[PDB]
Design a protein around this ligand. Structure first.
Ligand SMILES: O=C(c1ccc2c(c1)NNS2)N1CCOCC1
Length: 282
């Protein structure tokens, strides 16, 4: 079926939970043996969210190459994304090592450091120009260059230096700051505006390594971001845009990381975002 009318048909019939459970039942199951090794317990935020072995990002290190991160490679859309958990106190150096090694231009953050009164990720970037951060375990230096605070999101320019080679690179930090503590946004307008700002920066384009996107677990809000981006790109590429099937795209993405889209409310919000976005594109 088309999307917008499939949408009203699920609303009128109130069957979002049944649609979402079908997706959960059909989703791929692949091994995640490296994630579950005892030496990696303090590298995982949640025991039930792990990268598959076949798609995990490897650190260029011979001691321990493990990070909780996955490469989502979308062949028809010609887009790739790295989805990862919010960094932990003992993985902030690994996080920036990955950004460096994978040649990423942009980092997309969809959570606040504290939500619901609890810490959802480490404070992994500097908050003042004159107070830079050094990660001694991976030999990187990170400096805040500029910050632009808007009503729904903040964009930061960061300098990452590989202290071993003295090479430097400019990284863009795109921080969506207004996702509610509970539920999903009432309107997708600010989320879509944010997606378009990431696109306009070049951070999603083939001349750079894959964008790094995270929330707390790296599957819920993060899944919504890449699902909406890929669906809108396919609607531009195909002769028949009504042939784009958001459930089929989501199942393709779940071949590369488990659990993408965590609730039926997040599934409905993803439909809403793609529907409204397809009108603005034209
Ligand atoms: O999809 C977008 C969107 C936003 C910005 C741009 C765009 C498309 N295209 N160029 S810039 N929406 C969805 C409807 O409400 C808000 C805007």
């Amino acid at each position: 079926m088309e999307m917008e009318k499939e949408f009203e048909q699920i609303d009128k019939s109130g069957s979002w939970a049944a649609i979402y459970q079908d997706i959960r039942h059909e989703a791929s199951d692949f091994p995640s043996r490296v994630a579950k090794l005892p030496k990696n317990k303090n590298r995982n935020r949640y025991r039930d969210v792990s990268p598959f072995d076949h798609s995990r990002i490897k650190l260029h290190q011979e001691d321990n190459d493990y990070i909780n991160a996955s490469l989502i490679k979308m062949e028809e859309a010609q887009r790739s994304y790295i989805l990862t958990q919010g960094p932990l106190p003992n993985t902030v150096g690994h996080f920036w090592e990955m950004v460096w090694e994978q040649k990423s231009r942009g980092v997309v953050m969809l959570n606040r450091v504290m939500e619901k009164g609890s810490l959802k990720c480490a404070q992994y970037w500097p908050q003042k120009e004159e107070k830079e951060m050094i990660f001694e375990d991976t030999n990187l230096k990170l400096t805040l260059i500029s910050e632009d605070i808007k009503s729904y999101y903040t964009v930061r320019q960061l300098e990452l230096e590989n202290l071993t080679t003295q090479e430097t690179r400019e990284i863009l930090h795109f921080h969506y700051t207004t996702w509610p503590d509970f539920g999903v946004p009432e309107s997708p307008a600010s989320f879509l505006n944010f997606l378009f700002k990431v696109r306009e920066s070049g951070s999603l384009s083939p001349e750079h390594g894959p964008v790094v996107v995270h929330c707390s677990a790296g599957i819920g809000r993060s899944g919504t971001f890449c699902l909406a981006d890929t669906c809108l790109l396919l609607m531009d590429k195909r002769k028949d845009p009504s042939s784009v099937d958001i459930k089929k795209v989501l199942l393709e993405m779940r071949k590369f990381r488990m659990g993408l889209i965590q609730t039926a409310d997040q599934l409905r919000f993803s439909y809403l975002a793609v529907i409204e976005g397809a009108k603005f594109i034209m």
